[PDB]
Amino acid sequence: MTELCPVYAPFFGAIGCASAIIFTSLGAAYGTAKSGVGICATCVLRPDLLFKNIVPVIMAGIIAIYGLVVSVLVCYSLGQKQALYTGFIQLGAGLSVGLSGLAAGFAIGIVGDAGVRGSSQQPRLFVGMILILIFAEVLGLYGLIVALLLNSRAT
Amino acid sequence: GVYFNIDNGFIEGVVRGYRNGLLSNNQYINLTQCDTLEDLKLQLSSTDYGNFLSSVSSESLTTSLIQEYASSKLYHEFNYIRDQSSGSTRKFMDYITYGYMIDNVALMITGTIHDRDKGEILQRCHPLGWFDTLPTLSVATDLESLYETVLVDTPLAPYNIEIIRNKLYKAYLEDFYNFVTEEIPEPAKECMQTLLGFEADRRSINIALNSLLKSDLLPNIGKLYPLATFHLAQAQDFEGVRAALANVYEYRGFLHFYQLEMELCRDAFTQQFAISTVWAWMKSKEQEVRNITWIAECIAQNQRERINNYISVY
Amino acid sequence: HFLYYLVLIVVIVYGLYKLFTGHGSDINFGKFLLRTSPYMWANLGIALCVGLSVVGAAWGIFITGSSMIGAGVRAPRITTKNLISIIFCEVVAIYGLIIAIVFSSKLTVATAENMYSKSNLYTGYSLFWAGITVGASNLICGIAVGITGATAAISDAADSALFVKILVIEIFGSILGLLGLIVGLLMAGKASEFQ
Amino acid sequence: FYTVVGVFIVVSAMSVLFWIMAPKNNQAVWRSTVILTLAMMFLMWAITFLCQLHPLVAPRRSDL
Amino acid sequence: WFQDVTREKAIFEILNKSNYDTNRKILIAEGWIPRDELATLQARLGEMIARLGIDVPSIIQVLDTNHTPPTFHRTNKFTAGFQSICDCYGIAQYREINAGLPTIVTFPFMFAIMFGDMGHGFLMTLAALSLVLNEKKINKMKRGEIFDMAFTGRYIILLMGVFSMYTGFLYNDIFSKTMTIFKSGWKWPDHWKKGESITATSVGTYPIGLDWAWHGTENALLFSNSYKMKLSILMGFIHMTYSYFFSLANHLYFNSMIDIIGNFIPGLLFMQGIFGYLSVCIVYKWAVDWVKDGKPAPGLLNMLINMF
Amino acid sequence: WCCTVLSAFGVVILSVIAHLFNTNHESFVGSINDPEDGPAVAHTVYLAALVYLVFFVFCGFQV
Amino acid sequence: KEEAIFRSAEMALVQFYIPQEISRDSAYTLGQLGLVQFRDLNSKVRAFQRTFVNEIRRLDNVERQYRYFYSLLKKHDIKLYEGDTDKYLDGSGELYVPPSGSVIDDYVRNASYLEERLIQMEDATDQIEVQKNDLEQYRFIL
């Protein structure tokens, strides 16, 4: 349309909504797949730890929930005639919870796979596992904080 | 070394935690003063063995029993690490066991060619190299028959009894030499070329030492491949191999193989983003399960003169 | 790998096509940097600030965390004594978070006129490269503190002979991250908001 | 601001009074916990009151 | 007849840690007792002497040593779940300031800052209250893996959900919405059209907590984030200096005046100046009306980065 | 048990929502995305409140 | 009794002149209290010369075969009713728990007898389970 609001301006917004959930779901997938292969190899012989050792896939799933919130929040601010200012803050919120939630979902996958294979040879590692795991989780929450803060400047 | 800890982080952290269970040179001085096997059991439980003989009795505690409970405790740790590895490391730990099953098909043939029992002979066989066809070894005593019949389905398939042993073992160690230079990264390149070469060295020296043509049964991957292979091929006496072994600066004066191995193994732990650690732990813990056995043989019968022949660099 | 040498032939052919036909001044990176929106550069510098900071912070965390969980199978006291190695991997993400909060405050809507002016292009380039400076310096310091805190985990297996020296080089990686922080705070120090 | 100081006086007075009339059975966990709870509660209340004492941001909405 | 064999072996193992004399058949085993428990040992020794006709001296006499005695903290059922999570980081020094006595209030409250909801704090009071109400009949049960952990910290979950019910009342937060229970300090204007931006005017301050006039507004994050982020700085600096003062509380008990002037006071001046100076300027900017004075409202973040 | 406690919470949470629509509360029907005619959306969760009271008293007989 | 919640407790290094006539019996009346953390007075002595180790090895060889008895209680699946009268006797509050006399030397010559008979009983009932599984598979083809 005009100079402030062109027609390619909701491409950034649409890409951002897609990016927020595809990159967090790729990181939460890698976290689930390495933790689930650590669980389904762990509890072959130690089946009574099946509810303690599942916290890496719950915690990797919280990255997916964080990604989902950003996508819903910036799809509420999408529109045909939107300014290009709000297009790039929806793309900044997109790839700031995106490429941070995939790296945080990767690090939950490697730490959670090392943890659930380690907190069964010695159960004293279960407190040390999750405190490392929280650190690899809130890096996705730090990505989420930027997105919320940056989506707070739309219109 | 920023990509190593993805698949091999928990692996190296636990293998480097197993080398602190390698009981040190002070841990043998208090362990060579027992004179009964019960007392040795009593103060072997303070180590990172950690009361592994808690189920056996004390009246019937054989010398072999400690040799096989400490090796079972070794081997459950090995295939605990082995089934947690990725496609660049699960293969490497399988290639460790491939040199074990060559010593198992070398012993099953020389045990089944003579009048012996399958069960009794099978007990002595090393259990890291164990494929499902290995308990047979009795279809034929012919070397040609074994390859088609029984070794065709094994991973020994791309590779008289000692003649086909070195025929398998040289092609194995060549295939294991050009695997560790292909898919294994830089801090274990220089390790798995030099440590592996040493294994080609002290096997090729034992070729000429046990032979007193020979150029096809000798492995050529080490420092003796270009020069010392031709000099060691035409050596018929002990002085011919003694003159041929003087050309290398790292092997002169040796013709002491495990002491040079353990000193070459203590520098292998000096790297700390490499997968040569699991070979250094395997050969170190297999060393200290025959050090404990060498002490327990000097304790079971009273041989106090030749005890201090255990060798620990760690 | 072949597509690198196929898009390099296209760049050579299209360069010599514009150059030989007198129209080599059509491939101008200046007019690209001057018709492009500054909110692109400013928010692809904020989102890639906290992005590459978290990517390096997590890269450090799964190196030294998966090392000291493996090292804690025998010595479990390391995970509550060598958790200082995963503090400084995560303060990397804090340093990419502070930059995001500070940078955001310079991110206001501009008018139709006074949009592609000198100061708006300045603060677009400034928040772009400063968010790359603190995002990729924190990516490298997170990787560095991870790979030197993972050697703190397999050396705390040994009792006390090395941790007092290892810590010094643990915090030398923190100082580099801090120095990267105070460069991005001076690159965008004189950058104004969008006016 | 003096309705933060005026509540700080009656919080401080109550805390001081408790310090001398704390139960003798478990003294170092009764007075310390009560004073700590009072101080934390006061700190949150005075922060969430002073942020709204003279605010620079007025609430803005369209749908009403 | 397994219990009195494991208990019978324990005595022998304890006995090994002793010394014997060739001349006199004695057995010395020096151990650590709390000094306020030397009354019980005399009575126990006397009772054993009465029930053993050897008329032994049994002289358990106390000597002074140079070694390091252990740290015995005496916790009942309320402060044992807070002492347990503060010494999984480390057993303290002998007669140091215990960290698990401030952790009773600091740890739930810190969680409460971050959780902060009356609905979610009410579901966590009812989750811990049920355990606290009948603790006698949970004291013997099957004692599962995530049920002993949820039961040994039943007071560290109850005091979480009560602090998070007070915090969710200061955040003006039931499950996702606000409590409209005091008169608001924000008065919306008289008349407006359906679909126009409306800016409220401050007519007062809300007595306890955030205004409920900040619910649904477009800049509800531009106030809450600034308030929470300055609350995070203020409540972290106060927890850093209340914890830091413990160092002076036990460099003055151990009679070490070198460590006070060498570590505490140089660190107190530096910490208070660099971050205390920051912390007193949140409160000073919160106590200055920057719209009736005609002065520009400063920026603390900008001010901090040009002190250095 | 799961449906007893779920309906015990259901009755209390849903009814106070029905009272915060029947009284035309500012936090529920004060937007432009509001459910209009608050006393008509209120009977949806009066009937939803008492159908949880049905699940509560029906599952309260197996206790 | 001053509480030890702000700082730690004031610890007193007591040492015990225990004679050799009640060394085994007086150790219970302070083991029942649960007050004294002992120190390693023998940390330089070789670990097999602590002058009670022949009296720990002989009830480790009794606890070695109690966990063999419990393995038989998991193979043949007996519910193991586990009467908790020992917890009712020693209430872990006061030193009223009496010691045991030469009943421990009856638990040695009792526990050993069970191991020998059980080992023979298990070997015999598993040797006829070998020819049971040998004949049950021969009746499959035939």
UniProtKB/Swiss-Prot annotation, chain A:
Q: What is its main location?
A: membrane
- InterPro entries tied to this protein: ATPase_proteolipid_c-like_dom, ATPase_proteolipid_csu, ATPase_proteolipid_su_C_euk, F/V-ATP_Csub_sf
- Out of the domains of life, which is the source? Eukaryota
What Gene3D superfamilies does UniProt report for this protein, alphabetically?
lithium bound rotor ring of v- atpase (1.20.120.610)
Pfam family, any one: ATP-synt_C
Query: Which one GO biological process term can you cite for this protein?
Result: endosomal lumen acidification
**GO CC entries:** fungal-type vacuole membrane; Golgi membrane; membrane; proton-transporting V-type ATPase complex; vacuolar proton-transporting V-type ATPase complex; vacuolar proton-transporting V-type ATPase, V0 domain
For site (Essential for proton translocation), what residue positions does UniProt give?
Answer: 137
Q: Where are the transmembrane segments?
A: 9-31, 54-74, 91-112, 125-150
**Amino-acid biosynthesis in keyword set:** no
Subcellular localization(s) per the UniProt record: Vacuole membrane
**Gene Ontology MF annotations:** proton transmembrane transporter activity; proton-transporting ATPase activity, rotational mechanism
| Record keyword Ion transport present | yes
Q: Which residues lie on this side of the membrane: Cytoplasmic?
A: 32-53, 113-124
Keyword entries, A-Z: Hydrogen ion transport, Ion transport, Membrane, Transmembrane, Transmembrane helix, Transport, Vacuole
> Which residues point to the Vacuolar side?
1-8, 75-90
Membrane topology category: Multi-pass membrane protein
According to the UniProt entry, the coiled-coil residues are: none
This molecule's function is given as: Proton-conducting pore forming subunit of the V0 complex of vacuolar(H+)-ATPase (V-ATPase), a multisubunit enzyme composed of a peripheral complex (V1) that hydrolyzes ATP and a membrane integral complex (V0) that translocates protons. V-ATPase is responsible for acidifying and maintaining the pH of intracellular compartments.
The family this protein is said to belong to: Belongs to the V-ATPase proteolipid subunit family.
Question: Remarks, anything else?
Answer: Present with 8450 molecules/cell in log phase SD medium.
The protein's name: V-type proton ATPase subunit c
What is the species of this protein? Saccharomyces cerevisiae (strain ATCC 204508 / S288c)
From Swiss-Prot, chain D:
Q: Which UniProt keywords apply?
A: Hydrogen ion transport, Ion transport, Membrane, Transmembrane, Transmembrane helix, Transport, Vacuole
Membrane topology term: Multi-pass membrane protein
A single GO molecular function term of this UniProt record:
ATPase-coupled ion transmembrane transporter activity
Q: Which residues lie on this side of the membrane: Lumenal?
A: 54-64
Pfam families tied to this protein: ATP_synt_H
The listed locations are: Vacuole membrane
Question: Which residue spans belong to the Cytoplasmic compartment?
Answer: 22-32
Query: Which GO annotations describe the biological process of this protein?
Result: cell wall mannoprotein biosynthetic process; endosomal lumen acidification; Golgi lumen acidification; protein-containing complex assembly; proton transmembrane transport; transmembrane transport; vacuolar acidification
Spans traversing the lipid bilayer: 1-21, 33-53
> Predominant location of this chain?
membrane
Q: Name one GO cellular component term.
A: vacuolar proton-transporting V-type ATPase complex
Which family does the similarity line name? Belongs to the V-ATPase e1/e2 subunit family.
Q: How does it assemble?
A: V-ATPase is a heteromultimeric enzyme composed of a peripheral catalytic V1 complex (components A to H) attached to an integral membrane V0 proton pore complex (components: a, c, c', c'', d, e, f and VOA1).
User: What function is annotated for this protein?
Assistant: Subunit of the V0 complex of vacuolar(H+)-ATPase (V-ATPase), a multisubunit enzyme composed of a peripheral complex (V1) that hydrolyzes ATP and a membrane integral complex (V0) that translocates protons. V-ATPase is responsible for acidifying and maintaining the pH of intracellular compartments.
Q: Name the chain's protein.
A: V-type proton ATPase subunit e
Q: Source species, please? A: Saccharomyces cerevisiae (strain ATCC 204508 / S288c)
Q: Which gene encodes it?
A: VMA9
From Swiss-Prot, chain E:
Q: Can you tell which superkingdom this protein's organism belongs to? A: Eukaryota
Can you supply one Gene Ontology CC term for this chain's record?
A: fungal-type vacuole membrane
Residues spanning the membrane: 97-115, 118-134, 149-178, 227-246, 265-285
Taken from the record's topology, the Vacuolar segments are 116-117, 179-226
Cite a single GO MF annotation. phosphatidylinositol-3,5-bisphosphate binding
Disulfide bonds listed in the record: none
Q: Which residues lie on this side of the membrane: Cytoplasmic?
A: 135-148, 247-264
PTM remark? Glycosylated.
Key word Glycoprotein present in the record? yes
Function, as annotated, reads: Subunit of the V0 complex of vacuolar(H+)-ATPase (V-ATPase), a multisubunit enzyme composed of a peripheral complex (V1) that hydrolyzes ATP and a membrane integral complex (V0) that translocates protons. V-ATPase is responsible for acidifying and maintaining the pH of intracellular compartments. Is present only in vacuolar V-ATPase complexes; enzymes containing this subunit have a 4-fold higher ratio of proton transport to ATP hydrolysis than complexes containing the Golgi/endosomal isoform and undergo reversible dissociation of V1 and V0 in response to glucose depletion.
- Quaternary assembly: V-ATPase is a heteromultimeric enzyme composed of a peripheral catalytic V1 complex (components A to H) attached to an integral membrane V0 proton pore complex (components: a, c, c', c'', d, e, f and VOA1).
Put simply, this protein is called: V-type proton ATPase subunit a, vacuolar isoform
Q: Which organism is it from?
A: Saccharomyces cerevisiae (strain ATCC 204508 / S288c) (Baker's yeast)
Q: Which gene encodes it?
A: VPH1
| Covered range of the whole protein | 309 to 616 of 840
Curated annotation (Swiss-Prot), chain F:
**Which compartment or compartments is the protein found in?**
Endoplasmic reticulum membrane; Vacuole membrane
Membrane topology recorded in Swiss-Prot or TrEMBL: Multi-pass membrane protein
One GO cellular component assignment for this chain's record is: vacuolar proton-transporting V-type ATPase complex
Taking the record's annotation, the residue ranges forming a coiled coil are: none
Reading the lineage from the top rank, the first entry is Eukaryota
**Example GO molecular function:** RNA endonuclease activity
The primary site where this protein sits is endoplasmic reticulum
Indicate the transmembrane segments per the record: 1-21, 45-63
Topological domain (Cytoplasmic) residues are: 22-44
Record keywords: Endoplasmic reticulum, Membrane, Transmembrane, Transmembrane helix, Vacuole
**What's an example GO BP annotation here?**
Golgi lumen acidification
Share what the entry says about its subunit structure, partners included: V-ATPase is a heteromultimeric enzyme composed of a peripheral catalytic V1 complex (components A to H) attached to an integral membrane V0 proton pore complex (components: a, c, c', c'', d, e, f and VOA1).
Question: What role does it play?
Answer: Accessory component of the V0 complex of vacuolar(H+)-ATPase (V-ATPase), a multisubunit enzyme composed of a peripheral complex (V1) that hydrolyzes ATP and a membrane integral complex (V0) that translocates protons. V-ATPase is responsible for acidifying and maintaining the pH of intracellular compartments.
Annotated protein name in UniProt:
V-type proton ATPase subunit f
> Which species is this record about?
Saccharomyces cerevisiae (strain ATCC 204508 / S288c) (Baker's yeast)
Lineage of this protein's species? Eukaryota, Fungi, Dikarya, Ascomycota, Saccharomycotina
